[PDB]
Design an enzyme around this catalytic site. Structure first.
Site, short mmCIF file in Angstrom:
data_model
loop_
_atom_site.label_atom_id
_atom_site.label_comp_id
_atom_site.label_asym_id
_atom_site.label_seq_id
_atom_site.Cartn_x
_atom_site.Cartn_y
_atom_site.Cartn_z
N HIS A 80 0.84 -1.20 0.00
CA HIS A 80 0.00 0.00 0.00
C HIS A 80 0.88 1.27 0.00
O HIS A 80 2.08 1.19 0.28
CB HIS A 80 -1.13 0.00 1.05
N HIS A 82 1.48 3.89 1.90
CA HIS A 82 1.95 4.62 3.07
C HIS A 82 3.47 4.52 3.20
O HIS A 82 4.08 3.58 2.68
CB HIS A 82 1.27 4.10 4.35
N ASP A 84 5.60 3.47 5.63
CA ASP A 84 6.24 2.25 6.11
C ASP A 84 6.38 1.18 5.02
O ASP A 84 7.15 0.23 5.17
CB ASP A 84 5.50 1.68 7.34
N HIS A 143 -7.51 -1.14 5.72
CA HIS A 143 -6.58 -0.20 6.33
C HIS A 143 -6.42 1.03 5.42
O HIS A 143 -6.29 2.16 5.89
CB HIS A 143 -5.23 -0.87 6.54
N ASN A 174 -3.89 3.72 12.89
CA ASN A 174 -4.29 4.85 12.05
C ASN A 174 -5.43 4.53 11.10
O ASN A 174 -5.27 3.76 10.17
CB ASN A 174 -3.12 5.41 11.25
ZN ZN Z 1 -0.62 2.14 6.26
ZN ZN Z 2 1.60 0.19 8.68
#
Ligand code: ZN
Ligand code: ZN
Length: 221
Positions: A80, A82, A84, A143, A174
Protein backbone atom coordinates in the site's frame (compact mmCIF):
# COMPACT_ATOMS: atom_id res chain seq x y z
CA UNK A 1 17.08 -17.65 13.20
CA UNK A 2 17.17 -13.90 13.97
CA UNK A 3 19.92 -11.90 12.20
CA UNK A 4 20.34 -8.33 13.48
CA UNK A 5 21.83 -4.79 12.59
CA UNK A 6 22.53 -1.86 14.96
CA UNK A 7 21.17 1.74 15.14
CA UNK A 8 17.78 2.29 13.54
CA UNK A 9 17.57 -1.37 13.82
CA UNK A 10 16.97 -4.00 11.13
CA UNK A 11 16.32 -7.67 11.87
CA UNK A 12 15.50 -10.68 9.77
CA UNK A 13 13.99 -13.91 11.12
CA UNK A 14 13.66 -17.11 9.16
CA UNK A 15 10.26 -18.71 8.69
CA UNK A 16 11.42 -21.48 6.38
CA UNK A 17 14.28 -22.43 4.01
CA UNK A 18 13.62 -19.58 1.56
CA UNK A 19 11.32 -17.22 3.45
CA UNK A 20 12.38 -14.66 6.00
CA UNK A 21 10.59 -11.82 7.74
CA UNK A 22 12.24 -8.43 7.81
CA UNK A 23 11.39 -6.07 10.66
CA UNK A 24 12.58 -2.47 10.98
CA UNK A 25 12.07 0.07 13.72
CA UNK A 26 10.66 3.41 12.50
CA UNK A 27 10.38 6.28 14.95
CA UNK A 28 9.30 9.91 14.69
CA UNK A 29 9.05 11.46 18.16
CA UNK A 30 6.25 9.73 20.09
CA UNK A 31 4.82 6.75 18.17
CA UNK A 32 7.78 4.35 17.60
CA UNK A 33 7.12 1.26 15.52
CA UNK A 34 8.48 -1.96 13.95
CA UNK A 35 6.97 -2.86 10.59
CA UNK A 36 7.27 -6.21 8.82
CA UNK A 37 7.91 -7.40 5.29
CA UNK A 38 9.24 -10.61 3.71
CA UNK A 39 12.55 -11.58 2.09
CA UNK A 40 12.20 -14.35 -0.47
CA UNK A 41 15.41 -16.18 -1.33
CA UNK A 42 14.82 -17.37 -4.90
CA UNK A 43 17.20 -18.96 -7.41
CA UNK A 44 16.80 -15.81 -9.50
CA UNK A 45 17.61 -13.35 -6.74
CA UNK A 46 16.06 -11.83 -3.63
CA UNK A 47 12.45 -10.57 -3.70
CA UNK A 48 11.09 -8.36 -0.93
CA UNK A 49 7.48 -7.90 0.15
CA UNK A 50 7.54 -4.21 1.08
CA UNK A 51 10.52 -1.85 1.50
CA UNK A 52 10.83 0.27 4.66
CA UNK A 53 10.03 3.56 6.44
CA UNK A 54 12.62 5.54 4.49
CA UNK A 55 15.55 5.30 2.09
CA UNK A 56 18.18 5.02 4.83
CA UNK A 57 16.53 1.89 6.23
CA UNK A 58 15.76 0.51 2.79
CA UNK A 59 19.42 0.70 1.72
CA UNK A 60 20.54 -1.06 4.92
CA UNK A 61 17.98 -3.79 4.46
CA UNK A 62 19.03 -4.42 0.84
CA UNK A 63 22.69 -4.35 1.78
CA UNK A 64 22.12 -6.74 4.67
CA UNK A 65 20.27 -9.35 2.62
CA UNK A 66 22.47 -9.10 -0.50
CA UNK A 67 25.60 -9.76 1.52
CA UNK A 68 24.03 -12.63 3.50
CA UNK A 69 22.31 -14.57 0.71
CA UNK A 70 24.93 -13.61 -1.86
CA UNK A 71 22.50 -12.49 -4.56
CA UNK A 72 20.88 -9.21 -5.63
CA UNK A 73 17.46 -7.91 -4.64
CA UNK A 74 15.70 -7.79 -7.99
CA UNK A 75 12.04 -7.07 -7.18
CA UNK A 76 9.91 -5.53 -4.44
CA UNK A 77 6.14 -5.80 -3.87
CA UNK A 78 4.61 -2.64 -2.27
CA UNK A 79 1.39 -3.53 -0.38
CA UNK A 80 0.00 0.00 0.00
CA UNK A 81 1.03 3.67 -0.52
CA UNK A 82 1.95 4.62 3.07
CA UNK A 83 5.50 5.48 4.21
CA UNK A 84 6.24 2.25 6.11
CA UNK A 85 5.65 0.42 2.82
CA UNK A 86 6.84 2.82 0.10
CA UNK A 87 9.28 5.12 1.90
CA UNK A 88 12.26 3.53 0.17
CA UNK A 89 10.87 3.75 -3.37
CA UNK A 90 13.59 6.23 -4.50
CA UNK A 91 16.35 3.78 -3.47
CA UNK A 92 14.61 0.92 -5.30
CA UNK A 93 14.16 3.02 -8.45
CA UNK A 94 17.74 4.29 -8.64
CA UNK A 95 19.21 0.82 -8.08
CA UNK A 96 17.17 -0.77 -10.83
CA UNK A 97 15.02 -2.83 -8.40
CA UNK A 98 11.56 -3.53 -9.84
CA UNK A 99 8.82 -2.06 -7.61
CA UNK A 100 5.52 -3.86 -8.26
CA UNK A 101 2.17 -2.45 -7.10
CA UNK A 102 -1.41 -2.05 -8.25
CA UNK A 103 -2.32 0.92 -10.46
CA UNK A 104 -4.17 2.40 -7.48
CA UNK A 105 -1.14 2.19 -5.18
CA UNK A 106 0.93 3.81 -7.97
CA UNK A 107 -1.66 6.64 -8.36
CA UNK A 108 -1.82 7.25 -4.62
CA UNK A 109 1.97 7.24 -4.35
CA UNK A 110 2.20 9.79 -7.17
CA UNK A 111 -0.60 11.84 -5.55
CA UNK A 112 1.39 11.97 -2.29
CA UNK A 113 4.74 13.01 -3.80
CA UNK A 114 6.48 9.64 -4.06
CA UNK A 115 8.13 8.13 -7.08
CA UNK A 116 5.89 5.68 -8.84
CA UNK A 117 6.03 1.93 -8.52
CA UNK A 118 5.03 -0.10 -11.62
CA UNK A 119 1.26 -0.32 -11.24
CA UNK A 120 1.43 -3.75 -12.84
CA UNK A 121 -0.48 -5.84 -10.29
CA UNK A 122 -4.15 -6.66 -11.05
CA UNK A 123 -6.76 -7.92 -8.55
CA UNK A 124 -5.10 -11.34 -8.65
CA UNK A 125 -1.56 -11.55 -10.04
CA UNK A 126 0.62 -14.62 -10.09
CA UNK A 127 4.34 -14.10 -10.38
CA UNK A 128 7.24 -16.52 -10.14
CA UNK A 129 10.82 -15.78 -9.25
CA UNK A 130 13.19 -18.64 -9.82
CA UNK A 131 11.05 -21.42 -8.41
CA UNK A 132 9.32 -19.19 -5.84
CA UNK A 133 5.62 -18.68 -6.60
CA UNK A 134 4.00 -15.51 -5.38
CA UNK A 135 0.38 -14.45 -5.68
CA UNK A 136 -0.84 -10.89 -5.04
CA UNK A 137 -4.49 -10.25 -4.19
CA UNK A 138 -6.51 -7.07 -3.77
CA UNK A 139 -9.35 -8.04 -1.38
CA UNK A 140 -10.97 -4.62 -1.21
CA UNK A 141 -10.59 -1.58 1.04
CA UNK A 142 -9.60 -1.79 4.69
CA UNK A 143 -6.58 -0.20 6.33
CA UNK A 144 -6.30 1.86 3.13
CA UNK A 145 -8.19 1.99 -0.13
CA UNK A 146 -5.41 0.15 -1.96
CA UNK A 147 -4.07 -2.46 0.46
CA UNK A 148 -3.14 -5.84 -1.01
CA UNK A 149 -2.09 -9.11 0.58
CA UNK A 150 0.57 -11.48 -0.68
CA UNK A 151 0.28 -15.26 -0.72
CA UNK A 152 3.01 -17.93 -0.99
CA UNK A 153 1.13 -21.04 -2.32
CA UNK A 154 4.05 -23.39 -1.81
CA UNK A 155 4.03 -22.60 1.90
CA UNK A 156 0.49 -21.32 2.55
CA UNK A 157 1.98 -18.19 4.05
CA UNK A 158 -0.02 -15.00 3.89
CA UNK A 159 1.50 -11.53 4.20
CA UNK A 160 -1.44 -9.53 5.54
CA UNK A 161 0.29 -6.18 5.65
CA UNK A 162 -1.57 -3.43 7.47
CA UNK A 163 -5.01 -4.99 6.64
CA UNK A 164 -4.15 -7.52 9.38
CA UNK A 165 -3.48 -6.56 13.01
CA UNK A 166 -1.30 -8.62 15.36
CA UNK A 167 -2.52 -10.05 18.69
CA UNK A 168 -0.77 -7.17 20.47
CA UNK A 169 -2.74 -4.59 18.47
CA UNK A 170 -5.58 -3.60 20.78
CA UNK A 171 -7.02 -1.04 18.33
CA UNK A 172 -7.18 -0.16 14.61
CA UNK A 173 -4.19 2.16 14.74
CA UNK A 174 -4.29 4.85 12.05
CA UNK A 175 -7.73 4.97 10.45
CA UNK A 176 -7.36 8.34 8.70
CA UNK A 177 -7.16 6.61 5.30
CA UNK A 178 -9.23 3.57 6.31
CA UNK A 179 -12.63 2.18 5.33
CA UNK A 180 -13.89 0.62 8.56
CA UNK A 181 -17.23 -0.48 7.11
CA UNK A 182 -15.57 -2.33 4.17
CA UNK A 183 -12.56 -3.69 6.07
CA UNK A 184 -14.52 -6.66 7.44
CA UNK A 185 -15.70 -7.77 3.98
CA UNK A 186 -12.14 -7.45 2.66
CA UNK A 187 -10.94 -9.69 5.48
CA UNK A 188 -13.73 -12.13 4.73
CA UNK A 189 -12.57 -12.08 1.06
CA UNK A 190 -9.09 -13.15 2.20
CA UNK A 191 -10.49 -15.93 4.44
CA UNK A 192 -12.66 -17.17 1.59
CA UNK A 193 -9.82 -17.13 -0.96
CA UNK A 194 -7.31 -18.88 1.33
CA UNK A 195 -9.14 -21.51 3.39
CA UNK A 196 -5.94 -23.25 4.63
CA UNK A 197 -3.33 -20.82 6.04
CA UNK A 198 -0.05 -21.83 7.70
CA UNK A 199 1.27 -18.48 8.96
CA UNK A 200 0.06 -14.89 8.73
CA UNK A 201 2.46 -11.97 8.80
CA UNK A 202 0.88 -8.71 10.02
CA UNK A 203 2.17 -5.33 8.82
CA UNK A 204 3.40 -4.71 12.40
CA UNK A 205 3.87 -7.08 15.32
CA UNK A 206 4.47 -10.78 15.82
CA UNK A 207 3.72 -13.45 13.23
CA UNK A 208 0.55 -15.46 13.84
CA UNK A 209 -2.02 -17.53 11.99
CA UNK A 210 -5.63 -17.29 10.71
CA UNK A 211 -6.40 -16.05 14.22
CA UNK A 212 -4.97 -12.65 13.34
CA UNK A 213 -7.67 -12.23 10.70
CA UNK A 214 -10.33 -13.08 13.30
CA UNK A 215 -8.65 -10.70 15.74
CA UNK A 216 -8.88 -7.86 13.18
CA UNK A 217 -12.60 -8.62 12.53
CA UNK A 218 -13.12 -8.20 16.28
CA UNK A 219 -11.27 -4.88 16.37
CA UNK A 220 -13.64 -3.65 13.66
CA UNK A 221 -16.66 -4.18 15.90
ZN1 ZN B 1 -0.62 2.14 6.26
ZN1 ZN C 1 1.60 0.19 8.68
Amino acid sequence: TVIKNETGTISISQLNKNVWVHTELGSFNGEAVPSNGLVLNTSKGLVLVDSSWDDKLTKELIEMVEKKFQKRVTDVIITHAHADRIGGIKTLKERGIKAHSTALTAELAKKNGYEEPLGDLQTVTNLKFGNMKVETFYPGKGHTEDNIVVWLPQYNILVGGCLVKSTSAKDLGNVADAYVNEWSTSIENVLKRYRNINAVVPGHGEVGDKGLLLHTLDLLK
